[PDB]
Amino acid sequence: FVEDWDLVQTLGEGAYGEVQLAVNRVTEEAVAVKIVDCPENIKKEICILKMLNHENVIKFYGHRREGNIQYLFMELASGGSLFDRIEPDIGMPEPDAQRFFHQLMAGVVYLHGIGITHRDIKPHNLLLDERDNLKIADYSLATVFRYNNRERLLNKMCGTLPYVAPELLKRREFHAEPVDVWSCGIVLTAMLAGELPWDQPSDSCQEYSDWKEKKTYLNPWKKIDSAPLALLHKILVENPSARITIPDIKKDRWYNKPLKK
């Protein structure tokens, strides 16, 4: 079907391009292939993809272009997505949420350490392997924010509104890492409550104003235990310079609470 690989079933559908299960005729290995038909975007995407080597990031195996279709071969995540484990209005058990958050932080420290920002962290982009290990997927908006040890500020507005940090809507230029931290906090909220707190983090949004006025007797907050809520209070801080960094998340009390066998 494509060189030595047989394309056997549809795993999902993207904006521009489906993902299929592909099985090697000789070795029997099953991978995923993203099929894509704005052509410079994939060259950048491929270039970032070749950099990735971590247990909580989807691995890139290579690509082949046939005609105008690019085939991106990658690690298969056969457990579906984190979005499927979140029950609406409920979330998931706190131990399971803590485990996924620890894995998410591991993958995000990894990306940041190679100078890559993901820019669209959300449950649909966090896939699971067959042992429910989390894999950060989808590098279509990813970009370099540090190169030769020099940081560059971002200016492009991108991502998904309910997950996006407020500076991205307010500031001409902004630091990459606190944006990804913020999206992880919205992810953690979703996992603990089964609901997103706001349409977008703007002063025109009542639910966002209500959080900034600390009305945590409202939903989703009132569904979340005090210990993880204290962490969310340090993550979902409007001023990105005052927002908690990953090294400090790792010192948080709930982060370090024993919960799971």
Ligand SMILES: Nc1ncnc2c1ncn2[C@@H]1O[C@H](COP(=O)(O)OP(=O)(O)NP(=O)(O)O)[C@@H](O)[C@H]1O
């Ligand atoms: N490596 C993988 N293993 C298993 N399923 C995958 C894999 N990659 C993607 N998928 C599924 O295919 C879907 C669409 O692929 P992808 O194009 O990467 O996401 P998307 O929804 O299109 N976002 P974008 O590419 O930004 O439009 C994903 O949401 C997953 O459900």
